[PDB]
Write a protein that binds this ligand. Structure first.
Ligand code: NA
Length: 171
């Protein structure tokens, strides 16, 4: 019965909850690189997370990107599979979890000639990613959801990353 808080001492956010939230909040569509030389517009979709399985305190993400790579002489479409890693950090003020310092762990690009361009543009993509996800939270605690979530917002004593899920202690 919904009148009883599942958990009384903490609140838990699963990989699946983070994924659905990202699916809502992730609208990453940015320009990366050097206009007129190697300048890509990149849209990131389908971000799926893995919580705290490698580095105990870090999160991993897989996603797809579509790119339009541009130069003064033309453009070419590219697609990309990415693996990313980030550091979840809780902002008490906003009652929100941010995936900070996001960077590309591995990437595969098609077509082939776009492979070397993207390797060069990697640090630009890293910049766009961490600027985007440093300010767009991955998860925001609401007051009009479960009572547990309401209580996390009010009491949250930071977060703790465990295998498979993010825990927000009330204590
Ligand atoms: Na940027």
């Amino acid at each position: 019965h919904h009148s009883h808080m599942n958990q009384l001492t903490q609140y838990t956010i699963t990989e699946q909850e983070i994924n659905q939230s990202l699916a809502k909040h992730n609208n990453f569509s940015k320009d990366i690189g050097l206009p007129g030389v190697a300048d890509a517009h990149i849209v990131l979709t389908n971000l799926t997370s893995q919580i705290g399985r490698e580095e105990p305190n870090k999160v991993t993400l897989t996603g797809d990107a579509n790119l339009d790579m541009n130069s003064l002489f033309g453009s070419q479409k590219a697609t990309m599979k990415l693996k990313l890693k980030a550091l979840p950090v809780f902002d008490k003020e906003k009652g929100a979890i941010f995936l900070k310092e996001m960077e590309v762990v591995d990437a595969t690009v098609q077509p082939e000639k776009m492979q070397t361009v993207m390797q060069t543009l990697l640090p630009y993509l890293n910049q766009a990613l961490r600027n985007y996800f440093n300010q767009q939270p991955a998860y925001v605690l609401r007051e009009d959801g479960s009572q547990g979530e309401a209580m996390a917002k009010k009491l949250a004593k930071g977060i703790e990353v465990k295998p498979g899920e993010i825990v927000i202690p009330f204590t």
